[model samples]
Target: KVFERCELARTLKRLGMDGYRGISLANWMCLAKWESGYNTRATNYNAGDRSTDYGIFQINSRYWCNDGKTPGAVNACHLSCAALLQDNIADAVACAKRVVRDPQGIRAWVAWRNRCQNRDVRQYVQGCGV
Candidate 1:
């Protein structure tokens, strides 16, 4: 569990997430909501390839997390998938920033692809006061 939408915005702002790494606060809000609804324990095991998406940002085992069996796993963030599942989310935030520093940046998020790409997501934080 994390925060309500408005509360999350405030927290993120303090963490410098509002406009960090070129991703807008609204876009991030929309991404997190569409990905995991702010649930830290969220995970998605893909039936297509057995890959897993972990935590609120849904970082994937194939690229960001080490699940011990993901073939050719990049482990780009050098983090265990389990670490991303923690309630504190400090690790998740750190790894997510590393991911954002990559070439794909926000493109690393599939949720961004489907729900936030090329869209004006400013409404996601319209009244959040971040």
Candidate 2:
């Protein structure tokens, strides 16, 4: 967990998406706390279901791992982190930057946050840098 967070931080710094440097770290910690509790191997099995949601981001393998066409689609890790790490933090930060640029402030992250909660973690419909 520490390694991943450090790597993510380094990746973000390298991308010059440090505009929200302080807030970004807080946001990352918030997400790590909320999503997997810092467990890279975390999985979710909601509502007494037998099927499992997989990985650090708790992304359902059925949705995120099934197709490359989907945004955040990657097979390496959970769909959430896989999606973020697939293109490196640049992809994730770019998406976040787009949301921050929006008039809605963090509300833009609300959608993705909800998705993450629901074990979805798909890419945004509108590009993150938009």
Candidate 3:
């Protein structure tokens, strides 16, 4: 599912992403915008690491979800990589929250740092009324 911008903002806000671990909703929107373009089923393979990133936030199989292929990978989210590719984003959202709980906070996603950090991300949710 490729969600519309404002629609995604409202959805993420409803899922408690507004200030999850001090990361604002706009930042989350910015992350998703760059990570997967709001596409729920997006996937990317990392040949260098033998891992894959899945879903809207592009959670990586190397440490978050189990793809049963990445060597020595840890399933910290206790979910299959397939779960992150669903049209419904509940599991993906839960796992994203877990990723932020670590010491890295939202920096668990480098895309967020490169694209959203220190930027005026309010544009992401500007008209969403979130």
At residue 126, give the lDDT of candidate 3.
Answer: 85
Residue-wise C-alpha lDDT for candidate 2, range 2-87, written one tens digit per residue: 23455544555566654463344435434544566545556565444333444433444433343243444344332343454342
Candidate 2 yields a Cα-based lDDT of 0.44
The Cα local distance difference test for each model comes to: 0.84, 0.44, 0.93
RMSD of candidates 1 onward, in order: 1.6, 10.8, 0.7
Give a tens-digit lDDT track for model 1, residues 1-130.
7658887777767777867877788887888899999888888998677789999889989988898977778888998999999877778888888889988889877778988899888887888777
Judging by TM-score, tell me the better candidate of 2 and 3. 3
Q: Residue 25 deviation, candidate 3, in Å?
A: 0.4
* Rank list by lDDT: 3, 1, 2
**Candidate 1 wrongly placed segments (more than 4 Å):** none
**Total backbone clashes of candidate 2, pairs 3 or more residues apart or in separate chains:** 0
lDDT of 3 by residue, 1-130 (tens): 9999999988988899999988899999999999999999899999999999999999999999998889989999999999999988999999999999999899878889998899888889887788
Deviation (Å) of 50 in candidate 1:
2.5
Cα lDDT over the full model 1:
0.84
Which candidate number would show the highest lDDT if scored against the true structure?
A: 3
Off by over 4 Å in 3: none
At residue 64, candidate 3 shows an lDDT of 97
